Design a protein around this ligand. Sequence first.
Ligand SMILES: [Ca+2]
Ligand SMILES: [Ca+2]
Ligand SMILES: [Ca+2]
Ligand SMILES: [Ca+2]
Ligand SMILES: [Ca+2]
Ligand SMILES: [Ca+2]
Ligand SMILES: [Ca+2]
Ligand SMILES: [Ca+2]
Ligand SMILES: [Ca+2]
Ligand SMILES: [Ca+2]
Ligand SMILES: [Cl-]
Ligand SMILES: [Cl-]
Lengths: 628, 625
Amino acid sequence: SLQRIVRVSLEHPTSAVCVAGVETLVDIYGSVPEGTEMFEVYGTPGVDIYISDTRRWRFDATLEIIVVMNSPSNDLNDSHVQISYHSSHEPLPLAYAVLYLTCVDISLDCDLNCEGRNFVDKRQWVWGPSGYGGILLVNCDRDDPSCDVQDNCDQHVHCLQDLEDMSVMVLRTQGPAALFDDHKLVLHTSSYDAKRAQVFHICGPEDVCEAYRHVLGQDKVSYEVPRLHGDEERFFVEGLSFPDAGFTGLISFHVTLLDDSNEDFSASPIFTDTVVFRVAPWIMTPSTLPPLEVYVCRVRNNTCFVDAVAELARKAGCKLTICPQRWIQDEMELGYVQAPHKTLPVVFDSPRNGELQDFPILGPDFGYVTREPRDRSLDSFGNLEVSPPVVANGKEYPLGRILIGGNLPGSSGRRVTQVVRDFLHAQKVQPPVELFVDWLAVGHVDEFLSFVPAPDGKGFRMLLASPGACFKLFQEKQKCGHGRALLFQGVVDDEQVKTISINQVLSNKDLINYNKFVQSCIDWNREVLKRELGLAECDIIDIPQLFKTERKKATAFFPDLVNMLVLGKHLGIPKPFGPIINGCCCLEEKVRSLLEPLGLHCTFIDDFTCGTNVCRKPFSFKWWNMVP
Amino acid sequence: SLQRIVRVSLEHPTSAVCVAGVETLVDIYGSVPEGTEMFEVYGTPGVDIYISRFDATLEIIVVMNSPSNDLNDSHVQISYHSSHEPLPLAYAVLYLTCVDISLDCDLNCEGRVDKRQWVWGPSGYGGILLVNCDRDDPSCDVQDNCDQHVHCLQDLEDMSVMVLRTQGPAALFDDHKLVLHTSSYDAKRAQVFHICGPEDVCEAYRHVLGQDKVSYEVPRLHGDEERFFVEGLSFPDAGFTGLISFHVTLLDDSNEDFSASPIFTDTVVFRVAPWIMTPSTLPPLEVYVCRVRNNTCFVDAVAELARKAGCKLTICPQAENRNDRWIQDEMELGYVQAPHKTLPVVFDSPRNGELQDFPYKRILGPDFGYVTREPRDRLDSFGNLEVSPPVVANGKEYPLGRILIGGNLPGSSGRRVTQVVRDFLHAQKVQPPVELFVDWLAVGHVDEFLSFVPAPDGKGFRMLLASPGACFKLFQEKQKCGHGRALLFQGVVDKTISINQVLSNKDLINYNKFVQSCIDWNREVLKRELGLAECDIIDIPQLFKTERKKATAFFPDLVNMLVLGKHLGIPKPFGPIINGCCCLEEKVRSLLEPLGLHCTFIDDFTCGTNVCRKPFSFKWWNMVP
Ligand SMILES: [Ca+2]
Ligand SMILES: [Ca+2]
Ligand SMILES: [Ca+2]
Ligand SMILES: [Ca+2]
Ligand SMILES: [Ca+2]
Ligand SMILES: [Ca+2]
Ligand SMILES: [Ca+2]
Ligand SMILES: [Ca+2]
Ligand SMILES: [Ca+2]
Ligand SMILES: [Ca+2]
Ligand SMILES: [Cl-]
Ligand SMILES: [Cl-]
C-alpha cells in the first residue's frame, strides 16, 4: 500500500509529488472553516478520488480522502485536487483548499529470474522453484588480457568482456524534468553491502570502457543520479565477496526520491524502491559429472602416468592440460558459479603464500577464490570431496553434499582450518558431512571413498575400500589352489621389491587383524554416509583393498583402488600389483567384475612406477531452485 | 537411525561395546565356511536379536536395552551349519558390553524430541543459557565471567546445568575414554565448570571448557552422574546466531598399537538468551535521576511521582564524563530471561569510561548485568533508541514489541547509530527494529516526537505523536473564543508571546506545517510496521522552531514524558493562560485523563530520567521470529 499523507492549508495552495499507484491521503493542517458541515472534493482528469467523488455533497466526520494517479505527469503541477467546504446555512461555499499534484513513476528493477513465479515484493529473495530474485556473480575471473590481477580489484572497467559477468540494474523515472531540478534521486546501499559489491553507471557509449563510471563501491554508499538517457538509467553490478561466515550472501540497492524544494528547510523522503541480489555461491562438481578438462603435471619419472592419463582423456574426449611444477589434486579444488546470464568455472586455491600456477588457470571466464588463515603459520584439499545428488533425512540435496575429513574429539591438530569450513558451510547449497579419517596416516577422503556413474538405481554407486572384500577374495583364491600366486610380480631382475604370496598374506595374523580394525573404521563412515546420503546397501560397492601400518596409522598395502580418475564411463584405476592367476591380476579381474556390469570401462594405470584434477560441467539443476 | 556395524571373525572371538537402545548390525569379516549353509543366532538374556535360516544378503540386528553390570557379561553366538551334516560348520562369538551415555540439560519442556535442535514457538524446546555478566562477587569489581574460576556460590544461580549420565562397568572406562568437547568458535563464547568436590567449595568447580579448552576427558567421580555448569560469555551478534553446542563422545582406545575410534556421540544445544528492551507500558520498578545543584525542583517532582507510583527511586551521582542527559541517553535498560533466572541488564552506550553504570550496584551489581560495545570508527545516543508495546503487523506477531531506531537519510554525511549497535539489536532477533525519519530534528531523538502510554481501551496502549497541526487547531479555536491575547511563557520567573503573534507569524506556521509532514511520514511508517489504526494514535499539540535549519521544540516537549503505570510526569508547557489554567495543559489533560492516566506537569527548564521495568509476562522463547 505504501500509503502517504499530504496536508492542505486554507490560506495557501499546497503542491506535492505522488508516485503512480501509491495512495495519497489528503488531510488538513489547521482548523476547517467555522461552520463546516459538508465538503466536496473534485479532481482534474487523471486523479482518482475515494472516500472511506461522484456524489458531491458529503457529510462531515472523521473520514479519510484518498487520491490516486496512475500515469506520470508531463508538466509540473499539471493536475490538482480542490476541496470545497460548505455550510448548510449558506449557499456560498465556506472555503476552498487546493492541492496541486505532480505524478512520477520511479522503479529500480533487475532480472528477477522469473519463469516459475510476476509482481511480487522486490525487497525479498526467495529460494525454490517458486522463488525469484536477482543473482550477482563475484567478478573474480580476470578477463583483461593485459592485467595481472582479478577484474574486481580496481574501480574501473578495462575490457568490454568484463560486463558479461556483471548484473544489470535499470532505473526508470517518468516525469517532468523540472521536478528533478529540486527533487534529488539518490541510489544508495549500506556500508556493509558497499564493501562487497560495486556499481558502475553508464554515461556514454557502450563501446567506451571509460563511460562506465564507478558510482558505488568501497567507500561510495550514495550517489545522486543524473537522468542523462531520458527515462532509463543503466547500472552494472559487480560482486566482490562470496558468502562467508558473517555474510549470508544478500546485497541490497535502493533508490530514494528526496524532496529538496525548500532551501530553508531540510530534505524529506518521498518514495523508496529496492532490489535485492544474491551472490552466487561456489559449487563443487562430483566425479559423476561430465568432464571437460583434465590437469596433469609432467615431472621426471612419471612419463608413463601422464601418457596413460592423456590416452584416457582422448578416449573420453575431454581436453588435457599439462601443468608445470604446484600439486594438481590437493592444493586446489575446481567448482563453478552460475547465474542466468553467465557461468564461470572457479578454482578454490588452498590457503598458502604465493602465486603458484593457480593465480598466474585464472584467465578469461575462469575465476579464482581463496582464503587466508587466522594463524599465518596447512590445508590439503584431499580432505575435501563431494557426493552426487541425494535425498536423505526427508531433505533433498540436488547439488550433492560436501564431504570433509574430520578431527577426532580430543585430537591435537585440526585437519581443515576454520576459514575453509566457514566458507564451505556458508555456500549453503552442499551442506557438508564430517567423516572419520584420523585412523589414516594421511587422512584423505579418496583413500577409502569414491563415486562412479551407473545406469541402474541412482545415477551413481559409492565405492568403499574394504579389507574384508580382499580377505574374502584371497581366501577363495587359496581354496581354489592359487595360494602360491605372488603379489607385486611387476618387474623382476630390474626392480628390487620383494614379492608376497596369498598364503603368506593369509598367514600373517597381525596384518589380518589390523585390516579388520581398518574395516571397522571404514564401517563407521559407511553408516554415517548411508544416513547422511540416504543410501542403501545396493548403492555401495566394497572394493577389495588391504592396509598396512605406518606410524601406527593406516596406509595402502597395494595401490589405492578407490582413488580413480572418473571421466564419464571411462575409469583410470591405479594398477594393483596383486596375485597373478592364469595370466591376470585377480584384483584387476575382481574390480572388472564389479564395475564393468555398470557400463564402465576399466583401464589400470601404473602410478607406482602424480596429480590429477578435473574441471567438469555444472549441474543441470539450478542452485537457486534448491530449498535449503 | 544411529545404526552401527560390528564384524565377527571365525578364528578370533570379538568383543564390542554397544549403547542402550542403539541398533548394532553384526556382519562377518572374511568368508563363511565352505559349502551350502544355514545359520542360527542365539543371545544371552538381555540381548534382543532380529533378522531382516536360509543364506542370503540379509542382516542380523542386535539390541540391548539395559546397561551391563560386568565387562563382556553378554554375548551373541552365530553357528554356521551345512544341510549335509548335523555337526555345525563353525562358531563365531561376539561378546558385548552395554552402556548408557546421555548428555542432558533442562530442555524447557512444558508444551512439547531431537536433542540436537533448538526450536522456537510454544511447541518448541531447548536449553537456554544466560550471559553471566552481572558481578555477583562483592569483592571482584568486574563481571563474573571474566576469569576462569567460581568465586561465590550465588554465581551458580546464573549458570545452566548439564548432566552426563553413564551407566556401565567401571573397567570399561579404563580403555574407553569419555570426552566432553565443543567447537573452538563455541569455546570462545561459553565456559563449562565440572563439579568435583562438595558444592560448598568454590574451588571445587574446576574450569574444564573455556577460551582455549575445547576438549576434556571426564573422570567419573560421582558414580553414574557428573555435573557441569555452563556460563555464557557473549550475546548474539552479527556473526553469532546465539546457538552453542556441547557433545560427549565415547572413544575406543583398547589397543595401544592402533588408533582411537568413535563409538557414540550425544549432543546438547543451548540458546543464549537475548537482550530485550522494555517499553513504557510495562510496570516500573526503579526510576533513576541525577541530582545536581540548582535542579532540586525537578528531582523533587520525580520523587513525588515515583512515590505516587509504587516504584523505587535512585539519585545517581555524576562522574567526570558528563553528557547533559546521561540518565536517558548514555544507557538503556533491558533484561535477559531463562526459566531459572531473570536478570535486568544495562546496555551502556559505546563510549570511553566507567561512569556509574559499570561501578555501582543499582546498575552493575548482583543480579544486574552489563553489556556494551566498542565502535570501529570515530557518536551513539540512546535517545535514538526506543521500543513499542506488543503489536501485530504484516500478518506477524511481535509479542515483545519492536525496537524503533532513528535512521539516517540517504546521502547524509554522518551516522547517528553506529553499526555495532544496529548489529546487536538486529541479532537479538526478538524485537525486529524499525527505521524512523529523524534527520529533520536538530538533535534527532525519537522521544522528541513519539511516545507510548498505557490505556485500558483497544490494544492496551496509545501512541502519542507530537503534532504542530493539533496546536494550530487549538490556538485557532482559542482565538475564535476571544483568547487571542493570552500569553505563552507567562508563568516564568527568569519574553512572552501571544496567541495572536504566534498565529500571525506566517514563517513559523509554514515551518510547522513542514514539521507536521515530517512527522506524518513516520506516522504512516509506524501505522504500517506496528499494525496501528487512527484510533490508536493521539496528536499531542506541539510547536517547533528552527535551529541550524533543523527542528527544535518551541515550548517544552510534551511527548517526552515519564510514564510510571497510570502516573504521567509531563514537561510543563508554559502556554497561554486562560481562566487561570494553561490551555496546553488542559488540552493534554482532556486527551489523556479519559484513559485513566494522572497528569503531573513538571518544570524541567527552570535533566535525565530512566526506568527499570518488569519483564514481559510473555516468554521470549515462545515467540516465532
Ligand atoms: Ca574492473
Ligand atoms: Ca571479468
Ligand atoms: Ca595466500
Ligand atoms: Ca568473464
Ligand atoms: Ca579433493
Ligand atoms: Ca568467575
Ligand atoms: Ca553472576
Ligand atoms: Ca569503552
Ligand atoms: Ca546473579
Ligand atoms: Ca531510550
Ligand atoms: Cl573449460
Ligand atoms: Cl530492581
